[model samples]
Target: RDWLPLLGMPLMLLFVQIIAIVLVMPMQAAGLVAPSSVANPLIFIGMLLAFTLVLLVLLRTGGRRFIAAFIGFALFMTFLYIFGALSLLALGPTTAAAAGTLIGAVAVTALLYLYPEWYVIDILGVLISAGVASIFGISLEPLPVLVLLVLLAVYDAISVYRTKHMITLAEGVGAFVMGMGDLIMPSILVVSSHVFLSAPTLGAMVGSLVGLAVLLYFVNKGNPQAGLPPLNGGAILGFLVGAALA
Candidate 1:
């Protein structure tokens, strides 16, 4: 309990990512998000880019308050997606999946504002991460996921080192609960790809090790190096080698 807050976020996120990769991605691969192609890589990237652009523009126009609102909206959407999918599965009917998801999401948002406890936050984070990973992993191929990871790692490095704008963004947004939630969100994709449940040899443990190594080193050095490069790079290299050895 004492360390819950400190360990909760990382642990919850890790569990959520693992569940997503192991359970959710297979659902997606089995064609859960049919018709709309909700798992498409290009669409996923476009949506993310759009979200980032909107957030940037919002920061420029309205400052921190607007950014806070954006975070809330993102959290809301995440909840909705998670619950909506589950509702579809449980109800045996496709009716109101989006609406169910939205409703579920809104409830979580309300709790976030009202309670914001460690467990509450962690639970919601897991749901959101699992939902998001399932949708994306099912949509994109391994190569595309690898490419996206590599690109984001490069961008994260540039933002931290060259422009240093992400630092400002981090400082400005760190205190916001929703912002932190978003920061940990993308990592689910990496975990999902490596998961072996139902899709043997999917989860790339070696890659995770390499990425963790880099992350730990950077944390120790306190220099804030790029994350995805070491992480995704490690994962990709491990994946290729794993495939060859198999």
Candidate 2:
């Protein structure tokens, strides 16, 4: 059971790549992406800090069920975005499709909140992570994505090495305690790389998976370690390599 996340991570990364590719264009078309060009990377970094603070408040102020409900609501909203995009792509963007997607989003979200089982969380995690990663990948331009990946890698290093936190917990809430931010941070770069419709992002995707393999090795040693550094670092490396060759 504990090996679930270790083994499941690569699958998750693969899914993130596939789904991000699917949604990147649609999300851009729908105008739901992050800012196209971040003039100053500091601004976006500050925004991340603000979001982190917001999450802390959410975790601190809510009952367990309520917290799960809030997370569920977020997932539902994200699902609506996905379903809406897919439906539009398939059915010519009709209002009826939008309504149907909303209904489906609510029902699926309700099921997650009610069940909250391991498999449910796993499956839904794939969807939510892909959806989250794709939005920013579409919005952020290359410069911002690069700056973000570098800065986040640094922060992850500091958090794990200095402050003893890795931007998320791997054992706090579940076997996989990774923060949504960590997942999105690196995956966003992959999406950002792929937004140009080039194969460069494939390199970054591979590098991140390699990094995950390393992280899992350390994790299996029975010690807590930060995940983002390896994953993000590997992704950045791969992005650079891919950009160079492709």
Candidate 3:
């Protein structure tokens, strides 16, 4: 096999971005997005910093059993919300559907906890991508999302290239640090685009895809690369172009 999942990485990039772009709506419908000020991008980055620190602590302190179980449970809850939000659109926001959706998430989560195969991990990655994009996209408007993306992009670079801790973290966890996680940043651009200008959502999405295309070109060759800059940087320019339509 050619290692298509690793080589043909754009598949992961494209689907996750599109799914997250779509998810923002249902997530909003479910009253999940909490808006924040444009001046407050650092606050969210602070949240991110805190999250990474906690995740590392979790892996170091709790061991694989706890870490894996925790990740699975987190996946379960996010999928439940996604199911709940979509069911609202499909079934007139009824309670019964929410219960069914919740049950579905529970079942899938339990299965993943037991199996944790590559495909299952991929599905969970998409879910988490959508959830993170929706939550942060709604919270940070376009400019703020741009700022946040840039901030995190730099931070990711330092963590990966300079400190090497990010890479070490991946090894410690026995997988991609966030399980195909680059989609989150660009999808946030998509969500922000949705809120501000209608057109850039498409522009930013395309840009993000293009960025992934370029990034994967380098990645298929072997050495580590900082994923966010090309992906998020490309997205920022595209979002701004699209933002002009606003």
Candidate 4:
């Protein structure tokens, strides 16, 4: 019972952040606003693969600090984009906008490390997720989005079970404060789909809630499965079913 009060604040903050990310789609679709799509899925995949290969090489060289630094850099970038949007500092289309974004990202990342508060992290996570989702939603059609999710699920499974490189990455990054901050990264995709498609069905929300419940159950059971099966899969299935019913 002692933990309950502390729990409410973090949980509320987390949920709010999640909702903000989810809302990005409708905002973008309505042209209330969003980011530009400079990168496509194929390009994204290629970049991810290249990044992974680079990380592997770093691991082979026993450059643990480099891995940490790389994660920090990534987190910084994500936070920067989110902050730029929220602060309205991202206005004006020019190289200065990009520089301002980097500065904002670095500042947010520094705050996260220094303070490490639940609300702070949650707010930043939501912003990053929203920014990323809006960009991808605007860039890709429904079919491409579907394909990307499916491919990512497959890749996540392989990384966890087969290659185990993902496992290594998880372990290396997981316990770190930065890793915890990074955990919110994937759920953005689900939010993006709902937002971009303008399909906020009851079923989608229901599936997401149910999937999260299942995820918690497994996590508590000490046999947590890969997240996508329950989270993304459930949400996608629910979305399709909801679309059909509508």
Candidates sorted on TM-score, descending: 3, 2, 1, 4
Error of 3 at 54 (Å): 2.4
Segments of candidate 2 deviating more than 4 angstroms? 1-5, 35-40, 63-69, 163-180
RMSD of 1: 6.4
Number of clashing residue pairs, candidate 2: 1
TM-score of each: 0.67, 0.82, 0.82, 0.61
Regions of candidate 4 where Cα sits further than 4 Å from its true position: 1-42, 56-73, 89-106, 115-119, 158-198, 222-224
- lDDT (Cα) of model 4: 0.54
Candidate 3 structure, TM-score to reference? 0.82
Candidate 1 Cα deviation (angstroms), residue 115: 3.7
RMSD of each: 6.4, 5.1, 4.9, 7.2
lDDT of the candidates, in the order given: 0.57, 0.73, 0.72, 0.54
Q: Write the per-residue lDDT of candidate 2 for residues 99-181, one digit (tens) a residue.
A: 77787788778777675675877667777777778876767677777777777777767666755544345558343535544
- Give the clashing residue pairs of candidate 2, or none: 169-177
- Deviating ranges (above 4 Å) for candidate 3: 1-7, 160-174, 222-225, 244-246
Model 4: per-residue lDDT, tens digit, 48-123? 6797787678768765667667777777766655554544433545567666767777777777777677567556
Model 3 C-alpha lDDT versus the unseen true structure: 0.72
Q: List the residue pairs that clash in candidate 1.
A: 21-192, 39-139, 80-101, 194-202, 194-203, 194-204, 195-203
Weakest 10 consecutive residues, lDDT, candidate 4?
Answer: 176-185
